[PDB]
Motif scaffolding. Structure first.
Motif, PDB file in Angstrom:
ATOM      1  N   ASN A 275       1.633 -36.193 -83.316  1.00 27.12           N
ATOM      2  CA  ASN A 275       1.786 -36.182 -81.833  1.00 27.12           C
ATOM      3  C   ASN A 275       1.184 -37.446 -81.220  1.00 27.12           C
ATOM      4  O   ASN A 275       0.999 -37.471 -79.998  1.00 27.12           O
ATOM      5  CB  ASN A 275       1.197 -34.913 -81.217  1.00 27.12           C
ATOM      6  N   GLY A 276       0.909 -38.453 -82.042  1.00 29.41           N
ATOM      7  CA  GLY A 276       0.248 -39.676 -81.549  1.00 29.41           C
ATOM      8  C   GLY A 276      -0.819 -40.140 -82.521  1.00 29.41           C
ATOM      9  O   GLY A 276      -0.848 -41.343 -82.820  1.00 29.41           O
ATOM     10  N   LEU A 277      -1.644 -39.218 -83.015  1.00 27.33           N
ATOM     11  CA  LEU A 277      -2.744 -39.583 -83.945  1.00 27.33           C
ATOM     12  C   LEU A 277      -2.169 -39.875 -85.329  1.00 27.33           C
ATOM     13  O   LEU A 277      -1.601 -38.951 -85.928  1.00 27.33           O
ATOM     14  CB  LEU A 277      -3.734 -38.423 -84.032  1.00 27.33           C
ATOM     15  N   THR A 278      -2.337 -41.104 -85.821  1.00 25.90           N
ATOM     16  CA  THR A 278      -1.839 -41.461 -87.172  1.00 25.90           C
ATOM     17  C   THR A 278      -3.004 -41.533 -88.161  1.00 25.90           C
ATOM     18  O   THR A 278      -4.144 -41.697 -87.705  1.00 25.90           O
ATOM     19  CB  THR A 278      -1.071 -42.779 -87.126  1.00 25.90           C
TER      20      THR A 278
ATOM     21  N   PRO B  68      13.892 -37.810 -76.489  1.00 28.95           N
ATOM     22  CA  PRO B  68      13.396 -36.895 -77.540  1.00 28.95           C
ATOM     23  C   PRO B  68      12.718 -37.470 -78.796  1.00 28.95           C
ATOM     24  O   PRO B  68      13.251 -38.386 -79.389  1.00 28.95           O
ATOM     25  CB  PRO B  68      14.703 -36.203 -77.954  1.00 28.95           C
ATOM     26  N   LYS B  69      11.568 -36.899 -79.174  1.00 25.63           N
ATOM     27  CA  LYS B  69      10.845 -37.324 -80.401  1.00 25.63           C
ATOM     28  C   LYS B  69      10.974 -36.192 -81.424  1.00 25.63           C
ATOM     29  O   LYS B  69      11.358 -35.087 -81.010  1.00 25.63           O
ATOM     30  CB  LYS B  69       9.400 -37.641 -80.020  1.00 25.63           C
TER      31      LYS B  69
END
Lengths: 49, 28
Positions: A31-34, A14-15
């Motif tokens: 969700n991944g894009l920083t 879990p994230k």
């Protein structure tokens, strides 16, 4: 007994989250894009995909 | 012109090198 074959770690785990903010400079993960910047609501029409 | 919107992504791992249908059937 775990294992890491050729394909991914699917099962995985879990994230979590934090909170939106909006109108303030904020470090950035989505969700991944920083990134980094003021995140105001928009007016675009992303396709449901 | 009509583009094709995604519909899935089955994250399997089989190696495919053939195929067939199971019953008009244009194939490229």
């Amino acid at each position: 007994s775990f294992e890491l074959l050729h394909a991914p770690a699917t099962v995985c785990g879990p994230k979590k989250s934090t909170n939106l903010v909006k109108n303030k400079c904020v470090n950035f993960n989505f969700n991944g894009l920083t990134g980094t910047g003021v995140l105001t609501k928009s007016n675009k029409k992303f396709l449901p995909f | 012109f009509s583009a094709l919107e995604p519909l899935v992504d089955l994250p399997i791992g089989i190696n495919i090198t053939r195929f067939q249908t199971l019953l008009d059937y244009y194939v490229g």
